[PDB]
Design a protein around this nucleic acid. Structure first.
Ligand SMILES: [Zn+2]
Lengths: 205, 251, 206, 150, 19, 98, 101, 100
RNA sequence: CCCGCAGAAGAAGCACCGGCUAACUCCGUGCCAGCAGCCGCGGUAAUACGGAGGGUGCAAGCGUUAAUCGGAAUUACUGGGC
């Protein structure tokens, strides 16, 4: 599942603009971020202490397009993984192919990156993969089948990628779909001001 | 620069920078397309003139012919205004705690004195007025002292007289040739717009009362008050700098 | 009840009559009558005019009528609009050549009437009583004055149990005749009940 | 910068001749992500007026904890009234593990990784201080060498 | 370095020798 | 016209022209020579730093007069920092050593 | 954290200098100053009323318009400050960075 | 939206509204001084969103109609003087303020 | 498991929204009909009943029930009290 339905309000509720609709304009106006996330938006929505941990929680969740159950699993693993439980979660979501593809010029939105993978359009280490959740360890070379490179929307996605700050933890020759996994993404350079701790905390009582 | 107030027209530098960006992107595209030697040389010739005009519009025909901006205004022109950047950097320009008004006689005042206006003295010594009221306890805070000075109560002029009791004001003429032009004096209260300058002081400054302005200057800090009272005072500066004879004399 | 009218109690000293004129039992009967009709009407077509008081002088078959308002211009008309209308409306209503001179209200935040008609109007605008009652009335303390006691009747907010509110600043010694205070009422017929309000502005002492 | 935090606010009453009056209270903890805190408790006839006092009273009468790397030096233990609180430091990765008061008092003292628990009474007015007293005792790994070095 | 500033400049110049 | 403090320009943090937004009444290069000839260094320093150019210096100086401490914390004028930026833009590499 | 960072900016602002050196700027020396390379000749977009994605007046390059807030939205207040946004790619804490950048 | 010529004036008492007419502009015969309002105020753009807190504020104090208001014209500080004549130049399409 | 052919085509629902507990208004009903884990809702302007609009959560699942541990430092060895 993936909810489907709308896509903007999702980025309006949390507050800041997510990454489920990237391209021209958008963000502020043509959606009206912080105007009325629904029927009763602009008013007096007092905050809590549990919601501040759950809201930030779904924020980083709805982004990569992950369901609750699937996400929770990411945390359970984020424990065993020796090291800061917080970061581990992110690195787990980041290393996810679904994102690895997007972040590499391909697809204007991770939601679209999905379609590519699933439709055998994406190929890793020489072999095609349709499982988005596919873990992309280091050295992993990503690309697109020689039978779909000069497609259309893909070769077009990398255009705005020229504006979107390029990834530093992974190389990629935009020329002929040559993505590479230089090394595990360190939170020190993870495009987002996510408060991972609020998550690991919420996931405990 | 806004023409109406939101339109935002491109300034003198932005027109020059836009020409370089337009030339750079146009030439860079032609190298990919593999254009012949005539066009690529002509494109580089335009970039040579565009970059040169941006840095220094001189010794070459360039820029607009007085449509909005008159000459060009390059980065070199921004530095070299008239005599380098002497007006802004060296001189100072504008300077806070200052004013200007028409000259006046007023022989009743002393030699080391000046009949300053009442409204000007209130405006010039505004932070001193807030500090005096806040210290005395008339105003509760600086917000109340700001509202009191803006409203102009009777108690403000009482505190203003004590604030301008032993504090000199640096008066100066328009053509400051010698050091005698810029001189300090004890600022006295007077119901009038025109500033009262002494008759003996008029000989040194050379300012005849025929629509001649005289800019004031409130001396802030402890050191400048001692410097203006000792060095730059009217009573101290009696004899001339060039000649041995007395400057302040009967004219 | 257990309070004397903070205005009428002083109608003798430090407080003028909002309708000074002579008359005998004969016409006096219908006299104060017309004054009501004219005064009641002058508000109907000039509610938003932000009118304070409304005096009524009467020399001889020619009442004056003075409409004090914070918003004079609006009570003036298009260079003759309002004035003409009213000044003419006082026709058969009094059957006499009735004039009309407007008076500008200085600082509409210290006048009871206004500060009362306002808060009530805000209430009708779906607004929290406490907020306006306090702040939207607290102003009377910033433009000067020394003391202002407000009062909001019951039925405030969703509740069947009517309740009165306090909130007062400075000092309002309404127990002093030489005190002089600006008191006035104001209703607000809302979805339910008629939340009332009383403004007590202490404008200096003697 | 000082970071205030509103724990909670109760109403409380008082019966008298005429009838019965009320006066909300409210408790507030303030501090910086460095190592200083101090709660506050003030009453008032108004919900906002109350918190106003508690805050003021909060900024003053603070404290200075011997925090280390965003956590405690060792698992301290404090108690007050009927509140029994035990705090323990944890390596980086574990967020602030605490219920109400504790969770707050720490989210301003400069704590980032802990895991406490309120044993005695869950009263905020106490569990809030039962925690402060804990850190107030927190013996830092320093000075100890001097406490018995010579 | 003139008048009032000459005393401060002379004292500051002496400090530059050692540090 | 008279003025204590108010509006400031965007390019070089200095007061406005005169008789419009803020009453400037320019000092000029010639008046600096008169102050230098008489020997008023502290009077000359505040005129071209404290109560004119420096943004941080002006804010600190304003609080000193209100409190009744006087003195001055001049620092850098900012107009000189613009000269470093303008010189930097035209190919020259200017920078404050030590 | 807030008091320490605010006090750090005030104390470190008062920084002296002995002398001023001048020399020719190299391609790498200019690259050391550079932020994100001016591409387009556009100043500001007239539809949204904001600086253009990548031009002469930009949010990602140089700095943002607001004191302590992002161009798009979600990176507001004195909180966050040091971080950079995912969408635009601009620092939160700036205010007067456009004066020096 | 279009910026109207007040006919209300935001965040002002009876003192400011007394000088102005029902039109919005200053009345005939009024000694202007300090910082009095010359010609109306108001602005259309707000973008606050109807929240439970904002709805209560709008119901209590209704700012003309929408939830947005600012300013237009006032007398400069220092300069003072009486009114002798007023002229209105409405666009070819917009309906003719009260004084016009 | 691969290659190909149509065509967005064939594929979203469930609970909840007074507080704990993330999500609010308008009708109707008028201690009735009904709700309900606890405190409690309902006797004319019910964020608690029922419907609707909207929102929240989870999702080929959702909710209820049953039942063990947790919360319970409430059988306290770790770890309570008279
Ligand atoms: Zn952004």
């Amino acid at each position: 599942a993936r909810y489907l339905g709308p896509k903007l309000k999702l980025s309006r509720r949390e507050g800041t603009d997510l990454f489920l609709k990237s391209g021209v304009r958008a963000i502020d106006t043509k959606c009206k971020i912080e105007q009325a996330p629904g029927q009763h938006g602009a008013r007096k929505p007092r905050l809590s202490d549990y919601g501040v941990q759950l809201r930030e929680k779904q924020k980083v969740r709805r982004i990569y397009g992950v369901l609750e159950r699937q996400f929770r699993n990411y945390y359970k693993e984020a424990a065993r993984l020796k090291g800061n439980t917080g970061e581990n979660l992110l690195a787990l979501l980041e290393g996810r192919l679904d994102n690895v593809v997007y972040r590499m010029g391909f697809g204007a939105t991770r939601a679209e990156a999905r379609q590519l993978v699933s439709h055998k359009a994406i190929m890793v280490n020489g072999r095609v993969v349709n499982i988005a959740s596919y873990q992309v360890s280091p050295n992993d070379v990503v690309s697109i089948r020689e039978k779909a490179k000069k497609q259309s929307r893909v070769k077009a996605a990398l255009e705005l990628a020229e504006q979107r700050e390029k990834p530093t933890w992974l190389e990629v020759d935009a020329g002929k779909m040559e993505g590479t996994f230089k090394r595990k993404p360190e939170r020190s350079d993870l495009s987002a001001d996510i408060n991972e701790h609020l998550i690991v905390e919420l996931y405990s009582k | 620069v806004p023409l109406d107030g939101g339109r935002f027209a491109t300034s003198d530098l932005n027109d020059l920078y836009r020409r370089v960006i337009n030339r750079n992107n146009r030439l860079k595209r032609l190298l990919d397309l593999a254009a012949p030697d005539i066009i690529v040389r002509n494109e580089k010739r335009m970039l040579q003139e565009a970059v040169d005009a941006l840095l220094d519009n001189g010794r070459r025909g360039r820029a607009i012919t007085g449509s909005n901006k008159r000459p060009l205004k390059s980065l070199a022109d921004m530095i070299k205004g008239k005599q380098g950047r002497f007006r802004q950097n060296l001189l100072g320009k504008r300077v806070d705690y200052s004013g200007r008004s028409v000259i006046t006689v007023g022989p009743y005042l002393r030699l080391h004195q000046c009949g300053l206006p009442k409204k000007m003295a209130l405006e010039l010594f505004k932070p001193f007025i807030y500090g005096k009221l806040e210290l005395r306890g008339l105003a509760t805070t600086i917000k109340a002292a700001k509202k009191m000075v803006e409203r102009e109560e009777a108690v403000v002029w009482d505190i203003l007289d004590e604030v301008i009791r032993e504090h000199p004001v640096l008066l100066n003429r328009a053509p400051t040739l010698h050091r005698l032009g810029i001189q300090a004096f004890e600022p006295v209260l007077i119901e009038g717009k025109a500033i009262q300058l002494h008759p003996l002081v008029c000989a040194a400054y050379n300012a005849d009362f025929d629509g001649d302005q005289m800019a004031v200057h409130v001396p802030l800090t402890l050191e400048a008050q001692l410097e203006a009272r000792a060095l730059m005072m009217s009573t101290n500066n009696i004899l001339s700098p060039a000649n041995g004879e007395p400057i302040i004399v009967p004219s | 009840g257990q309070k004397v009218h903070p205005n009428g109690i002083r109608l003798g000293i430090v407080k003028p009559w909002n309708s000074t004129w002579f008359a005998n039992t004969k016409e006096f009967a219908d006299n104060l009558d017309s004054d009501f009709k004219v005064r009641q009407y002058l508000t109907k077509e000039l509610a938003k005019a932000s009118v304070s008081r409304i005096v009524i002088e009467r020399p001889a078959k020619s009442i004056r009528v003075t409409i004090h308002t914070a918003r004079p211009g609006i009570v003036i008309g298009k260079k003759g609009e309002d004035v003409e209308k009213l000044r003419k409306v006082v026709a058969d209503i009094a059957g006499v050549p009735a004039q009309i001179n407007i008076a500008e209200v200085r600082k509409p935040e210290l006048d009871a009437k206004l500060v009362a008609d306002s808060i009530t109007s805000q209430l009708e605008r779906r607004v929290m009583f406490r907020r306006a009652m306090k702040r939207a009335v607290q102003n009377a303390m910033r433009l000067g004055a020394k003391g202002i006691k407000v009062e909001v009747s019951g039925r405030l907010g969703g509740a069947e149990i009517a309740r009165t509110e306090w909130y007062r600043e400075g000092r309002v010694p309404l127990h002093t005749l030489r005190a002089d205070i600006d008191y006035n009422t104001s209703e607000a017929h809302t979805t339910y009940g008629v939340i009332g309000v009383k403004v007590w502005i202490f404008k200096g002492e003697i | 910068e000082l970071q205030e935090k509103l724990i909670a606010v109760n109403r409380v009453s008082k019966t008298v001749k005429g009838g019965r009056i009320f006066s909300f209270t409210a408790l507030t903890v303030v501090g910086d992500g460095n190592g200083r805190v101090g709660f506050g408790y003030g009453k008032a006839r108004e919900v906002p007026a109350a918190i106003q006092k508690a805050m003021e009273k909060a900024r003053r009468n603070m404290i200075n904890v011997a925090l280390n790397n965003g956590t405690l030096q060792h698992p301290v233990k404090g108690v007050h009234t009927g509140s029994r609180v035990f705090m323990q430091p944890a390596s980086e990765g574990t967020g602030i593990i605490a219920g109400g008061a504790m969770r707050a008092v720490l989210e301003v003292a400069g704590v980032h990784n802990v895991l406490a628990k309120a044993y005695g009474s869950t009263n905020p007015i106490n569990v809030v201080r039962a925690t402060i007293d804990g850190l107030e005792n927190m013996n830092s790994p320093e000075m100890v060498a001097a406490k018995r070095g010579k | 370095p003139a008048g009032t500033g000459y005393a401060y400049h002379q004292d500051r110049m002496r400090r530059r020798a050692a540090g | 016209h008279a003025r204590s403090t108010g509006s400031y320009s965007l390019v070089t943090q200095q007061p406005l022209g005169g008789k419009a937004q803020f009453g400037g009444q320019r000092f000029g290069e010639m008046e600096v020579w008169a102050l230098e000839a008489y020997g008023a260094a502290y009077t000359l320093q505040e005129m071209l730093t404290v109560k004119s150019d420096d943004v941080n210096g002006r804010t600190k100086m304003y609080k000193n007069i209100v409190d009744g401490n006087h003195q001055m914390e001049p620092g850098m004028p900012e107009s000189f920092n613009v000269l470093l930026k303008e010189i930097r833009s035209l190919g020259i590499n200017i920078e404050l050593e030590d | 954290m807030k008091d320490l960072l605010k006090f750090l900016k005030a104390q470190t602002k008062t920084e002296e200098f002995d002398a001023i050196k001048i020399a020719l700027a190299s391609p790498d020396m200019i690259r050391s100053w550079s932020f994100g390379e001016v591409k387009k000749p556009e100043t500001i977009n007239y539809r949204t009323f904001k600086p253009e994605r990548d031009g002469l007046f930009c949010a990602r390059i140089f700095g943002p318009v607001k004191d302590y807030e992002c161009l798009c939205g979600k990176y507001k207040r004195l909180k966050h400050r040091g971080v950079i946004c995912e969408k635009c790619g601009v620092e939160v804490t700036q205010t007067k960075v456009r004066r020096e950048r | 939206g279009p910026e109207e010529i007040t006919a209300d004036i935001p965040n002002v008492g009876e003192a400011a509204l007394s000088k102005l007419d029902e039109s919005g502009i200053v009345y005939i015969g009024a000694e202007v001084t300090g910082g009095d309002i010359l010609v109306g105020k108001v602005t259309p753009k707000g973008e606050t969103q109807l929240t439970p807190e904002e709805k209560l504020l709008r119901a209590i104090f209704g700012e003309k109609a929408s939830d947005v208001k600012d300013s237009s014209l006032r007398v400069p500080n220092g300069v003072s003087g009486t009114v002798i004549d007023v002229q209105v130049f409405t666009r070819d399409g917009v309906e003719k303020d009260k004084r016009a």
